[PDB]
């Protein structure tokens, strides 16, 4: 297991424009195109991201390319974030993947407002962190995915991913 494999399980792979769990136009491996309700706007964002006129359809290679960029972006965002960086740095490699997972899904502003969970994570109070993390819109809207990510923070193992 690793962050790529973990997010591939959580996000799936779809080669045509689809709506994510929040109803937002998405493609590939959880690559959010736009929060706009306009499919044409989404198609424009897609073409811009890929560098050609796609008409809402991409290849697996193209999907994996955006995915690599997105994982890269999520990590680089964490390291540029003054609230996230020290917590991330304090973590082991398995829990670091759980942190990337969260940022990938909800964006770094979203995650940085988990102030109390973040503190508990840095103090390595794993059971307490886990309980706090579940007290969230995140958990209620995507409980199965959240439970997997939380188990990863709680245990520092990949048990929730097999």
UniProtKB/Swiss-Prot annotation:
GO molecular function: lysozyme activity
Top-level EC class: hydrolase
Known catalytic reactions: Hydrolysis of (1->4)-beta-linkages between N-acetylmuramic acid and N-acetyl-D-glucosamine residues in a peptidoglycan and between N-acetyl-D-glucosamine residues in chitodextrins
Effect of residue 117 to F: 10-fold decrease in enzymatic activity
Induction cue: Expressed late in the viral replication.
Keywords annotated in UniProt: Antimicrobial, Bacteriolytic enzyme, Cytolysis, Glycosidase, Host cell lysis by virus, Host cytoplasm, Hydrolase, Viral release from host cell
Listed result of changing residue 11 to Q: Complete loss of activity
Summary of pH dependence: Optimum pH is 7.3.
SUPFAM superfamilies linked: Lysozyme-like (SSF53955)
Active-site residue numbers: 11 (proton donor/acceptor), 20 (proton donor/acceptor)
UniProt function note: Endolysin with lysozyme activity that degrades host peptidoglycans and participates with the holin and spanin proteins in the sequential events which lead to the programmed host cell lysis releasing the mature viral particles. Once the holin has permeabilized the host cell membrane, the endolysin can reach the periplasm and break down the peptidoglycan layer.
Protein name from the UniProt record: Endolysin
Species for this entry: Enterobacteria phage T4 (Bacteriophage T4)
Taxonomic lineage of the native organism: Viruses, Duplodnaviria, Heunggongvirae, Uroviricota, Caudoviricetes
């Amino acid at each position: 297991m690793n962050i790529f494999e973990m997010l591939r399980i959580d996000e799936g792979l779809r080669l045509k424009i689809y709506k994510d769990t929040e109803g937002y136009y998405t493609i590939g491996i959880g690559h959010l195109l736009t929060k706009s309700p306009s499919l044409n706007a989404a198609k424009s964002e897609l073409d811009k991201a890929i560098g050609r006129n796609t008409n809402g359809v991409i290849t697996k290679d193209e999907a994996e390319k955006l995915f690599n960029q997105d994982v890269d972006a999520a990590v680089r965002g964490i390291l540029r974030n003054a609230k996230l960086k020290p917590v991330y740095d304090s973590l082991d490699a398995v829990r670091r993947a759980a942190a990337i997972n969260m940022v990938f899904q909800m964006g770094e502003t979203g995650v940085a407002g988990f102030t109390n969970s973040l503190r508990m994570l840095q103090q390595k109070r794993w059971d307490e962190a886990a309980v706090n993390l579940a007290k969230s819109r995140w958990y209620n809207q995507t409980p199965n995915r959240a439970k997997r990510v939380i188990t990863t923070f709680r245990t520092g193992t990949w048990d929730a991913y097999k």
